[PDB]
Design a protein around this ligand. Structure first.
Ligand SMILES: [Ca+2]
Length: 153
């Protein structure tokens, strides 16, 4: 319950060189939008989202150099704490995280996600618990599409 972590921004600042088309240490407009694909951005390759992407490109330029910097990228990363349609792509990572197992532990989500994104994921994930279960197991693939408790009202 504190949004992005200091550690999340510290490992995610490395994404500054991950998708960097020219490796300038900064993602430009067409470059930033490509980096963001792997994060599950709120924009897409459509004419409306490219305008909104440019709206963000203006706020992730705090140095007025026209390029996205490490301290700028975090601005989007803290938004990650809200739902998206692209979010299906990023949630696919839970299968890689699990590897072979049919459930993920809360601890495994809390390995790749130090921040609130871990608790967000844990909450919507299917509650696999009981004595036959290990403490803090969740079904990553059979997760609740109805969120943590937004049913049977
Ligand atoms: Ca660049």
């Amino acid at each position: 319950g504190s949004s992005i972590s200091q550690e999340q921004m510290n490992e995610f600042r490395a994404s500054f060189n991950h998708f960097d088309r020219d490796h300038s240490g900064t993602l430009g407009p067409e470059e930033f939008k490509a980096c963001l694909i792997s994060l599950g951005y709120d924009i897409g390759n459509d004419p409306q989202g490219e305008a909104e992407f440019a709206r963000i490109m203006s706020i992730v330029d705090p140095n007025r150099l026209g390029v996205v910097t490490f301290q700028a990228f975090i601005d989007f990363m803290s938004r990650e704490t809200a739902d998206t349609d692209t979010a299906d792509q990023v949630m696919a990572s839970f299968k890689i995280l699990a590897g072979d197992k049919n459930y993920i532990t809360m601890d495994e989500l809390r390995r790749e996600l130090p921040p609130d994104q871990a608790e967000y994921c844990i909450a919507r994930m299917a509650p696999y618990t009981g004595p036959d279960s290990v403490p803090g197991a969740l079904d990553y693939m059979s997760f609740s599409t109805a969120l943590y408790g937004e049913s049977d009202l």
